[PDB]
Write a protein that binds this ligand. Structure first.
Ligand SMILES: *[C@@H]1O[C@H](CO)[C@@H](O[C@@H]2O[C@H](CO)[C@@H](O)[C@H](O)[C@H]2NC(C)=O)[C@H](O)[C@H]1NC(C)=O
Lengths: 213, 222
């Protein structure tokens, strides 16, 4: 069974740059290699087939080449809308196996996060649980850190974070953080802080509120 | 206008069985090879198998040749996948795809149908409107939230105003916590839009036949 080894696994590159992805097959597979792009939220679309041919509709920026065990995929001039995961396939023989994929992300100007905090919904506290939600939207670069402070003390238990993929509309990231307390824990303290630390600023961004106000 | 739609996904017990289907339109289904692949949470694509137009040739990836069966009915424009003796290794998004003419390459891919292999039980989500902090201060814009907590299995679908509010939306990947998923979404609109106009989040959880809406309104008395 033929293995397809794809490198690199990750690529961060600036708009306009050229990038080249490499696929290596564990045995000769002639010219029978295909390349796919899978945009966030979307199903794969076919770009290159038989190593070097652009499928119908596929723009000029996309090219491929290779024969035997060495195959490459190239985007001559990367564009934000080209943000996707790219993977190869050999179709020389069954099983017609896929490479592991390369994730492509794009550089842009640094951007501070827009931050908003949310007290538990009115509709929730009845069920005996309390969730404080914090949104950190539209920032760059992607590395960011969130501290929850309750009446001054950092709180680390009960925190769940989730991250969007980069957005091809503005090349930014967003993050959601949720602190989960029992209703009782929640009612014993008054102030709840959401705290964002990001290289775009030297002091954390603080959004905060009081339980009775 | 080529199209594929995969069906039959859902929750299944380990050891059990499940039949996926795929409805094709917009092309002579009886002229094309068809195939299946799948993608497990966080991992690469995986080829499952293929079938020629006449059903006289059917091939499988070795690990699945004795669990999975591929079939088709050209009269119904439908491709099928019979899954049996499933384990958690089979939890993934299941795609059907058309092979391009004269290539063993997948020409068009369906949206996929999610399959979860688990002993845990179907649970409907709680849905909570999130309005901004009580002490409303004028800024140019305002941000709202919708919180979808404690459901199983995936997926859940979330929109704003039945889909007519699409800009300024961020819906975050669900996260698993003791056999239960939680998800949230934010929408940002200009402050002369809300609360003067209404904003509702719409959540569907098909596995539990849940269709729930929450209207978002400022905190305070009524
Ligand atoms: C999945 O589909 C298969 C095939 O259509 C079903 O099994 C067939 O069921 C008929 C009853 O109408 C039997 O007479 C056949 O012998 C079965 N064929 C095979 C190959 O087993 C099966 O019932 C379906 N399973 C589920 C869970 O819906």
């Amino acid at each position: 069974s033929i293995v397809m080894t794809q490198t690199p696994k990750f690529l961060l590159v600036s708009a306009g740059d050229r990038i080249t992805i490499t696929c290596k097959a564990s045995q000769s597979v002639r010219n029978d290699v295909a390349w796919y792009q899978q945009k966030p939220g979307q199903s794969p679309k076919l770009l290159i087939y038989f190593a070097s041919n652009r499928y119908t509709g596929v723009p000029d920026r996309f090219t491929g080449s290779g024969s035997g065990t060495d195959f490459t995929f190239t985007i001559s001039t990367v564009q934000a809308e080209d943000l996707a995961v790219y993977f190869c396939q050999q179709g020389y023989t069954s099983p017609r196996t896929f490479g592991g994929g390369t994730k492509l992300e794009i550089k842009r100007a640094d951007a501070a996060p827009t931050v908003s905090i949310f007290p538990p919904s009115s509709e929730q506290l009845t069920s005996g649980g309390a969730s404080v939600v914090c949104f950190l939207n539209n920032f760059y670069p992607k590395d960011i850190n969130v501290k929850w402070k309750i009446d001054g003390s950092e709180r680390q238990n009960g925190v769940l974070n989730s991250w969007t993929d980069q957005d091809s509309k503005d090349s930014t990231y967003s993050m959601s953080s949720t602190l989960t307390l029992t209703k009782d824990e929640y009612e014993r303290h008054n102030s709840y802080t959401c705290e964002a630390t990001h290289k775009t600023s030297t002091s954390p961004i603080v959004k905060s509120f009081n339980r009775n106000e | 206008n080529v199209n594929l739609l995969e069906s039959g996904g859902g929750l299944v017990q380990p050891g059990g069985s499940l039949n996926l289907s795929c409805a094709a339109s917009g092309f002579d289904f009886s002229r094309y090879w068809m195939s299946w692949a799948r993608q497990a949470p966080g991992k690469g694509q995986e080829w499952i198998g293929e079938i020629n137009p006449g059903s006289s040739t059917i091939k499988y990836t070795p690990s699945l040749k004795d669990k999975f069966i591929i079939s088709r009915d050209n009269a119904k424009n439908t491709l099928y996948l019979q899954m049996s003796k499933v384990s958690s290794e089979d939890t993934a998004l299941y795609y059907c795809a058309r092979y391009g003419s004269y290539v063993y390459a997948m020409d068009y891919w369906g949206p996929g149908t999610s399959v979860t292999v688990s002993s845990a039980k179907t649970t409907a989500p709680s849905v909570y409107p999130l309005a901004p902090v009580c002490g409303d201060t004028t800024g140019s814009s305002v941000t709202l939230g919708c919180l979808v907590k404690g459901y199983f299995p995936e997926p859940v679908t979330l929109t704003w105003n039945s889909g007519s509010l699409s800009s300024g939306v961020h819906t975050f990947p669900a996260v698993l916590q003791s056999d239960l998923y939680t998800l949230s979404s934010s929408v940002t609109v200009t402050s002369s839009t809300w609360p003067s106009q209404s904003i509702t989040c719409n959540v569907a959880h098909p596995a539990s036949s849940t269709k729930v809406d929450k209207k978002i309104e400022p905190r305070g008395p009524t």
